[PDB]
């Protein structure tokens, strides 16, 4: 099984002009490596992918793979509404080092079901990295089933797993129960931190949520802790991960936020956020400030 | 804190021919008393309020709060569309002698805030009963917020509770921090059996869920655990409850299955459901007892 | 083809106390007899059926087929949740004297496909009278699609037709090519007032919509002159019932607002609504009198 | 008021290996032309800007503008997920002599109200341009409301307009009543055949709808005939507009049926579309021939 455990979606740090902050990003990187984190995955939501074009993308996504250096496993996202960029995108990504990529559901149009595998096949067909499948509906407004990532699963040997953003027990449970059903090396990530422990006991395989990049021990510890057996302690860390979420109310997008508590608990870098984003105001920085206080993560 | 805890709703149990089977409703609370309930509501969802007249409801209540004798605390469910039936009912809970009565919001029109909060107000002055609040907003298709209910446990002193029916951490969550936060003693109980652990850890109190009719011990034992402060314990009940909700997927009500699942648990009752629910075919109803299998209830 | 044409959704008057206002009801009727209605629809959404008991509405409809005397083709709306009062409503409307029923799907649970489709035959079956079907997904949050609606056509020789209560072109010309498309003279209305016109040129059937209690002569006149093939004179009421629906916005339920519109436009009734609706407030009263007046209905 | 009357979203010409098809492009231009339009606005949805790279579109955009030649004028949709890249083409629209832009809301993150705004102000006052929003909320999963749209038009004098791209006489007749109620000379244009009459008829200002590629004349006569005050002939096209939204069922994306139409109509032009969309199958262009038989369009 491929890219199991806590796989944080890492912020793309910026400048105050707007482009890649090599020194803080690079920084960022080795706190995660450092705290124990078992990959990492870069253009993700909170890695502002949606707001990147074509090349810079590219460029971030060689940056960070050169960074890494092989230390832990690596997931390039990939994924947007243009598949011919999503293969140049992909390509690129295992041209440059990658581990695999991460490909969500076309998004602007939900597109015929038809149209949805033959993508899909598509862009695993460009590439001989593996391919983690990316769900959320929320956004997308298009939900991959467990039936059609079953279906995906069955279709090509190199799509081997997902990342499920929901606020569901029901959706990562029958996710679960019909696809590693069928194939027991099938990734099931989570894609929030209130789930990670739900996601395990189900027999589900870790998160890529936004808490890796600001308390990335809690996850990993509370991961650590169900390995040795020991779930009192598990579920300890489960009841910080509970009440986490609060904080992405603050915003929306959250990335801001995001970048704002990895300052707040210890990592001083750039908070710049690409638009449609915008700062966060002080009054709200401050209320995060109160809440990782309350968790004792700061 | 009123009505905190595990309490079940109760399964009505009728006859071939659709009346109330007295025995076997009878012999099903029973059960549920000595498994260690601490309460227990009739004529919720699972109950099928909403397939029963006026007048039956009443007979139901009746007998069912006379067969409990005050051994625990009685709910009754007395909401429907009907204002005017649902302050008839609420107030027959009352004189018939029931412990407090759970009100669902009107769920044919969606009706404006003005209009639900007058309706909730009105119910709530017409008995000196506590009220429970009920949120399904999946039937309902009208959530009612955690600021609605804040606005609502201001308003009315008897406005005391909420069952938040729900596949929703986040929901839960925010439920709790809003209204509990503003009134420490407002219980709130989660709908699902999948969410009784996270509800606990969140600060809730406890859960109204389809599992109490026929594995009451697990929500009980787990309810237990967490208060005698072994988590792994309860953890490991909450594990069992993860998995429960794969039977409510074999039809649609899935009271029939609720029902069936009794009978496979070792209570012989009559499984007949009122219309437009129907028997479980054979083929589904051997798929729940490998679950039930499975999962060692039975 | 039954049914067919303009059949207004017609208010039930209530007496301040919440009793049916006979000599009121009746006026009304009256009224819209002679304006030239093709029928009348007792007990339908405006009629206030999910705010009034089993009783009441068997007592309601009586009246109503009594004091029409067969002068134009009367309906009943015998839906509900409860699917044996349902049939017991459905039967009891035949003995009464309808001409047939209208019947919404169960809007509490939304019920599976085959229970639904089981539920609807069963009803049909209980009567020999015409069952007219009746959708409303914006309150019932469950469509009956035109592929379902062509099922149950196609199962039951007395399922003629369908009230489509739904603010889409695209639902309503699919429900026709789908269902007339099999079925000819199955009939095809349409439950809000600015479809008429569409409802006619692809070629349905007519109208159950609000504005038939209080400006029916513009519907019946549309149709009028659509069946006499002047289209420039049809579009010219159509032009109003464009606009009519801004009122639906002073309230929710909205049922006080066409009742009070009843008055402004000449006929005075008591106004009296059920709870959970309210009576419409002053401000919004003379906002209502003010829209008459600008369409030139008072 | 700019940008009223009939302005087709043109369809982006492509050959096999998906490079912009210059003349055929422009064959499909000047077929528009000729039949009258009031307008063209390339690269909506139709054209395929969200498979389109951003220089990919600049190019498209110039080409477009270039071959117009002023004859008509030209509309750019220069909107995305990539607010910076938003501004970039927006910003080239105008230096490359486009007569103004068309900007849909961010549609992967739904994005605050606050941000939502700022987003507008922000590419409104990059240009010195006409801009015209766009609303879509099926694909978007955010709804530009009558309210935020007299927001938008309060507070900048360049937000001119609106494309509303919806299945529902409410959105469009409250458009018109809270946009232009406060700015007669704002624009309102509906995205959908079906309502171009009805939008007419509340008082709107045209379509730009997938039918100006294929039958442009039926939506240009319709609205010739409505100034020239024959509404009776107007409401003949409107009974063809009605029934051309069928074909638009045959696949997802139906920019395929859309260029396929333009092919049997007469204009022999390449069908190739982008990924992840497809060509249409044999037997749906067969359908789709039959269809437009039917409706008298080849």
């Known amino acids: 099984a491929l890219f199991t455990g806590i796989i944080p979606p890492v912020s793309t740090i910026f400048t105050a002009d707007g482009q890649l902050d090599k020194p803080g990003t690079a920084a960022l990187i080795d706190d995660l490596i450092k705290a124990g ?137 029958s996710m679960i129960h019909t696809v590693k059903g069928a194939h027991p090396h099938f990734t099931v990530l989570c894609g929030y931190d209130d789930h990670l422990f739900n996601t395990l006991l189900l027999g589900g395989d870790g998160a890529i949520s936004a808490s890796g990049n600001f308390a990335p021990q809690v996850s990993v510890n509370l991961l650590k802790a169900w390995r040795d057996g020991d779930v009192a302690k598990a579920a300890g860390y489960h009841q910080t991960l509970l009440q986490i979420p609060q904080m992405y109310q603050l915003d929306t997008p959250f990335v801001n936020v995001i970048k704002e508590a990895i300052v707040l608990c210890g990592r001083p870098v750039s908070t710049h956020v690409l638009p449609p984003a915008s700062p966060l105001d002080e009054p709200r920085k401050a209320q995060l400030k109160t809440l990782l206080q309350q968790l004792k993560l700061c």
Chains 1, 2, 3, 4 share one sequence.
């Not at 074009?53 to 060689?62: D, L, M, Q, S, V």
């Not at 690129?92 to 076309?106: F, M």
């Not at 391919?131 to 190199?158: E, I």
């Open 37 to 173: 984190v078992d990959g990492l995955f870069f253009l993700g939501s909170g890695g502002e992918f949606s707001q990147l074009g074509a090349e810079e993308r590219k460029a971030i996504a060689r940056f960070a793979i050169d960074h890494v250096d092989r230390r832990v496993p690596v997931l390039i996202g990939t994924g947007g509404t243009n598949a011919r960029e999503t293969i140049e995108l992909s390509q690129h990504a295992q041209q440059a080092g990658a581990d695999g990529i991460v490909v969500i559901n076309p998004y602007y149009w939900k597109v015929s079901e038809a149209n949805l595998i033959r993508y899909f096949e598509q862009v695993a067909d460009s590439v001989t990295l593996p391919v983690m499948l990316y769900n959320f509906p929320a956004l997308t407004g298009q939900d991959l089933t467990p039936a059609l990532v079953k279906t995906l699963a069955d279709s090509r040997s190199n799509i081997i797993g997902i990342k499920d953003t929901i606020d569901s027990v029901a959706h990562l449970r």
